């Protein structure tokens, strides 16, 4: 139920996602998650709910439901904080909100640095994102310092393409390799090339939006729906499981970590009940065959950013 990272720590392969979890609901969601067995929570400063996630974590620690060492808490450095001198403060704000004295894993959220400031998405008057002149290798060195100062146990990356991963791996004077690359992954975006690349370098992959993020705010009614794909429903029926349970088990059997999001107690519990069955080897190849290179998480305003990750094949 845990996977070994290249920092020597073990990471639970199932975690709770928190993007779009409303601040007034996420405390209860995280409490319920911990009660039913979740030990890994995926967070981010940009999700604007870390204070409320932290309330839940703290209550369960205080209640003696779980020990801190058994929890695996992940957060992410937002794009406006890539400048080397801003990284520590960004991490400390997240630690303060989460009410923790360390993170288990801290990720560079996107490879695209944005202009520093209060706004999370600084745009020019024509709607293009305003970049920062930061070198991601300098950002990485700042992340490495967080490990040395004890603020985080592991560091990693998210939404990095293989060339960008390679840039880090080839960084002059590299001190800590990324432990994790967290990327979008599901049957319509199977990511075989990038996953094999990362795994071959000892980097663990976390699959985000495993259900296709049906609540993403930019969703359109005509968009494909994993949860309603009759082929996936058929596999679920064979196992007497839900389609969501199949979608969660799928990345687990590829040696990935997976972080489905819910604020619905029944679904939070349902999503955790994925250790009592196995997809067959043929279920796995068949689910892989559904790849469409359909990506739900990207921003048009970032497509001209020199570090936009999704122009490359992988
Ligand atoms: N690093 C990054 O750039 C990045 C990008 C995207 C996501 N992420 C992380 O990955 C997490 C998961 O991705 P996501 O939030 O995009 O989407 P997701 O986990 O694929 O799907 C979440 C949606 O599915 C619904 N749902 C959950 N369980 C269900 C079930 N058993 N049956 C039916 N519907 C169910 C949720 O509804 P309810 O909540 O209403 O129950 C919500 O609308 C995020 O929350 C975040 O932590 C990271
Ligand atoms: O980033 C996540 O974890 C989930 O997406 C969001 C999650 C949250 C929010 C958010 C929006 C407004 C206020 C606070 C948060 C946005 C977004 C969002 O659009 N993300 C896409 C994105 C981000 C950065 C760079 C690129 N890119 O280079 O293509 C794409």
Ligand located closest to 21 CA: 1
Q: Is the CB–ligand 2 distance for residue 108 below 6 Å?
A: no
Greatest Cα pair distance in the chain: 54
Which residues make beta-bridge pairs with 183? 207
Distance CA 115, CA 113 (A): 7
Distance CA 102, CA 249 (A): 29
Distance CA 294, CA 188 (A): 6
Q: Is 122 helix (H, G, I), strand (E, B) or coil?
A: coil
Ligand located closest to 75 CA: 1
Best CA proximity match to 41, nearest among 275, 263, 273, 279: 263
Which helix (DSSP H) or strand (DSSP E) does residue 38 occupy?
A: none
Please write down the HEC assignment for all residues of 171-221: CCCCCCCCCEEEEECECCECCHHHHHHHHHCCCEEEEECCCCCCCCCCCCC
Distance CA 169, CA 158 (A): 14
Q: Is 162 helix (H, G, I), strand (E, B) or coil?
A: helix
Distance (Å) of CA 210 to CA 135, 244, 272: 31, 9, 13
Distance CA 27, CA 268 (A): 13
Nominal resolution (angstroms):
1.2
* Cβ neighbours, 10 Å, residue 298: 15
In degrees, rounded to 5, the angle at the alpha carbon of residue 26 between the alpha carbons of residues 23 and 31 is 145
Distance CA 176, CA 144 (A): 6
DSSP symbol at 123: B
Which of 48, 262, 272 to mutate for ligand 1's pocket (most ligand atoms within 8 Å of CB)? 262
Which of 121, 158, 209 to mutate for ligand 2's pocket (most ligand atoms within 8 Å of CB)? 121
Expressed in angstroms and rounded, the spacing between residue 182 Cα and the centre of ligand 1 is 14
Beta carbons of 248 and 275 less than 8 angstroms apart: no
In the chain, which ranges are E strands? 2-4, 10-12, 16-17, 40-42, 72-77, 105-108, 155-158, 180-184, 204-208, 257-258
Expressed in angstroms and rounded, the spacing between residue 268 Cα and the centre of ligand 2 is 23
Expressed in angstroms and rounded, the spacing between residue 216 Cα and the centre of ligand 1 is 8
Catalytic residue status for 47:
yes
The experimental method is X-ray
Q: Is 95 exposed, middle or buried (0-12, 13-18, 19+ CB in 10 A)?
A: buried
In degrees, rounded to 5, the angle at the alpha carbon of residue 181 between the alpha carbons of residues 113 and 300 is 45
Ligand 2 atom at minimal distance to the Cα of residue 19? 7
Q: Is 155 helix (H, G, I), strand (E, B) or coil?
A: strand
Residues at the binding site for NADP(+) are 8-17, 209-271
Expressed in angstroms and rounded, the spacing between residue 297 Cα and the centre of ligand 1 is 12
Residue with the smallest CA separation from ligand 1 atom 25 is: 262
Ordered structural domains, the chain, with CATH: 1-314 (3.20.20.100)
Which of 15, 16, 17, 298 to mutate for ligand 1's pocket (most ligand atoms within 8 Å of CB)? 17
Distance CA 207, CA 192 (A): 12
Sheet holding 16-17, edge to edge: 16-17, 40-42, 72-77, 105-108, 155-158, 180-184, 204-208, 257-258
Distance (Å) of CA 298 to CA 44, 113, 303, 309: 17, 15, 9, 9
């Amino acid at each position: 139920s845990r996977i070994l990272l290249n920092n020597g720590a073990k990471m639970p392969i199932l975690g709770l996602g928190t993007w779009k979890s409303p601040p007034g609901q996420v405390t209860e969601a995280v409490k319920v998650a911990i009660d039913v067995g979740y030990r890994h929570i995926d967070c981010a400063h940009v999700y604007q709910n870390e204070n409320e996630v932290g309330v839940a974590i703290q209550e369960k620690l205080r209640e003696q439901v779980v020990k801190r060492e058994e929890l695996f808490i992940v957060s992410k450095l937002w794009c406006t904080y890539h400048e080397k001198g801003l990284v520590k403060g960004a991490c400390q704000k997240t630690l303060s909100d989460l009410k923790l004295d360390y993170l288990d894993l801290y990720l560079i959220h996107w490879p695209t640095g944005f202009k520093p400031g209060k706004e999370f998405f600084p745009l020019d008057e024509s709607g293009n994102v305003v970049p920062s002149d930061t070198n991601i290798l300098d950002t990485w060195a700042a992340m490495e310092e967080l490990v040395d100062e004890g603020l985080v146990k592991a560091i990693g990356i998210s939404n990095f393409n293989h060339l960008q991963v390679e840039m880090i791996l080839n960084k002059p004077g590299l001190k800590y390799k990324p432990a994790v690359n967290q990327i979008e992954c599901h049957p319509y975006l199977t990511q075989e090339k990038l996953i094999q690349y990362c795994q071959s370098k000892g980097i663990v992959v976390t699959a985000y939006s495993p259900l296709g993020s049906p609540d993403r705010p930019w969703a359109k009614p005509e968009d494909p729906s994993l949860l309603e794909d009759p082929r996936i429903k058929a596999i679920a029926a064979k196992h007497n499981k839900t389609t969501a349970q199949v979608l969660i088990r799928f990345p687990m059997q590829r040696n990935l970590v997976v972080i489905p999001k819910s604020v619905t107690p029944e679904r939070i519990a349902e999503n955790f009940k994925v250790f009592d069955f196995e997809l067959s080897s043929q279920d796995m190849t068949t689910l892989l065959s559904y790849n469409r290179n359909w990506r739900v998480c990207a921003l048009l305003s970032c497509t001209s950013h020199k570090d936009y990750p999704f122009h490359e094949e992988f």
